[model samples]
Target: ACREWLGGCSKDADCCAHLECRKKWPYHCVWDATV
Candidate 1:
């Protein structure tokens, strides 16, 4: 029922807010005023 679970992705806009999309696999979402 899924397209092979490629994991989640933020909008290009979100990428500016979150810089961790620069990594692979485990993502790491390391921006957003958090990590």
Candidate 2:
């Protein structure tokens, strides 16, 4: 499942299929609005 804002992730696969893992503090799952 997609984690809430500020959720931790290591890569895109770490987040939900609809979200992408961004390189930030501890990493996080950002919504893929481009899709």
Candidate 3:
């Protein structure tokens, strides 16, 4: 299960398979449906 915006993440691999780690304040997992 992927967490929403502002979710804690150290890297892209930390997020769910469908999510990518965005480099922003409070780095988090974002869903990229195109992927």
Candidate 4:
């Protein structure tokens, strides 16, 4: 299983407070918690 904020994130807003949402694609954000 993956962390709450790291899993199924389709947008930057879905990430945790400390995590900055990095762009994974033109329309998607990185879903990896490590990222």
lDDT of 2 at 1: 57
Worst 10-residue lDDT window for candidate 3 reads 1-10
State which candidate, 2 or 4, has the greater lDDT. 2
Greater-TM-score candidate between 2 and 3 = 3
lDDT of 3 by residue, 1-35 (tens): 55654576666764645567877767787764355
Residue lDDT tens for model 2, 1-35: 55754586667764655677877667887775465
TM-score (C-alpha, index-matched) for candidate 3? 0.49
Per-candidate TM-score against the hidden true structure = 0.20, 0.48, 0.49, 0.25
Q: Give per-model CA RMSD.
A: 7.2, 2.8, 3.2, 5.8
How displaced is residue 4 in candidate 1, in Å? 25
Instruction: Candidate 3: list runs displaced more than 4 Å.
Output: 1-6, 33-35
Total clashing residue pairs per candidate?
0, 0, 0, 0
What clash count does candidate 1 reach?
0
Clash pairs, candidate 4, are none
lDDT of 3 at 25: 64
How are the candidates ranked when ordered by lDDT, highest leading? 2, 3, 4, 1
lDDT of each: 0.37, 0.65, 0.64, 0.44
- Which scores greater on lDDT, model 3 or model 4? 3
Top-lDDT structure, candidate number? 2
